[PDB]
Design a protein around this ligand. Structure first.
Ligand SMILES: OC[C@H]1O[C@H](OC[C@H]2O[C@@H](O)[C@H](O)[C@@H](O)[C@@H]2O)[C@H](O)[C@@H](O)[C@@H]1O
Lengths: 142, 142
């Protein structure tokens, strides 16, 4: 088991997709994206996780909601890196796969930025969520 | 395996330690360091690479030379982060391991900076070299 540092802060509630990943490779990314990323929801084989973020419509009181973005992954497509900007929360995420680069979720990229290599491809994520994505940790197929 | 983007420029000649890295984990880092890093040379298990940089002493016409810096890694110690400043060439390299942060090689850090995280540890480097380190790419273990 290989995993990155946790990137983000202590708000929200912890989540962990470890068990759900026993379904198989990530086949889809769903996010909600505005000036910042407000939720993430990956699909492991055929099974989605819960929506990790945008806990309720009342969250408009603290950030914009944004637009739902989906990337359906093709067979043999694996997420191999993530550019993350973060501070108190995850601000923006830019995934790259072994087949293509994907657009950034979160138009603002002003906080500290790191490029996380994800050896063997991303296996699953853990982190913290509430009205947005408080933090993420990337667990690799290695 | 998964790799970072290529950081640097198109000068020099390509090198790639992939085949050498079959000989083992990185056990040693050697660099030549002045205001910029002028060469890099890793050891994989017991097997040293060629000196990637400072092709000859007349290279002093185009940059300073620097001092030789050796870091021996303990068993189970691996490089989990590389902060690189770069443009036309690699300017500076700051390696962090799971045990300690190593000093920057290259006292000047004025060029574009990137922080590459390598969960599980760096496996090997590739890049381009001549009088100095034209560029580097970081390869993970899977
Ligand atoms: O590795 C750097 C560089 O090394 C050799 O070039 C040395 C210098 O050549 C001068 O002609 C030039 O004006 C300088 O900019 C170069 O640093 C090597 O031949 C070259 O390919 C490399 O980029």
């Amino acid at each position: 088991q290989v995993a990155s540092e946790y990137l983000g802060g202590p708000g929200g509630d912890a989540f962990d997709d470890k068990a759900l990943a026993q379904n198989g490779d990530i086949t889809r990314i769903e996010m909600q994206c505005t000036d910042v990323a407000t939720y993430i929801k990956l699909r492991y084989g055929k099974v989605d996780s819960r929506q990790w973020g945008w806990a309720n419509e009342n969250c408009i009181q603290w950030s914009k909601k944004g637009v739902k973005v989906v990337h359906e992954l093709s067979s043999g497509e694996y997420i191999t890196s993530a550019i993350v900007t973060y501070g108190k929360y995850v601000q923006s995420i830019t995934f790259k796969t072994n087949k293509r680069t994907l657009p950034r979720c979160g138009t603002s990229a002003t906080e500290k930025s790191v490029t996380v290599l994800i050896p063997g491809g991303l296996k699953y994520i853990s982190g913290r969520w509430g009205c947005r994505i408080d933090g993420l940790r990337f667990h690799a197929k290695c």
